Amino acid sequence: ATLKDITRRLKSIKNIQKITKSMKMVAAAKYARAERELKPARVYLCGAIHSSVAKQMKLANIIYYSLKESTTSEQSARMTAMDNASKNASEMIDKLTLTFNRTRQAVITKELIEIISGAAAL
């Protein structure tokens, strides 16, 4: 607990949320484009992307294919992912504020009690 401490975290999670939130709207955009471009092509922090291929890793008419797919799946993944990230950040901004406000209040009381205590001992 430290109002300054809490204000940092809350300070920073407020940003990451908005960042995160922005990244999804982008991810959705590209993914729109992609679902369309995907249509015809079949008749021929990114989620678990790089890893999924990574684990299972141990005529070009097909290069465009795995590509044209690997982007829908990616822009899909980032989307959702960033969607939950801000969902997480929010749960946190809401959580930290409460700690803040409880501390805020407590600090004020604590002081007053100290004053009163010393005044009363005269």
């Binding site: 940092r8 300070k11 920073s12 940003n15 990451i16 960042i19 995160t20 990244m23 922090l45």
Partner: peptide
């Protein structure tokens, strides 16, 4: 504080 979590790539 931000690249801390969100990393550096973006």
């Amino acid at each position: 504080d931000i690249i801390a979590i969100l990393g550096m790539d973006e």
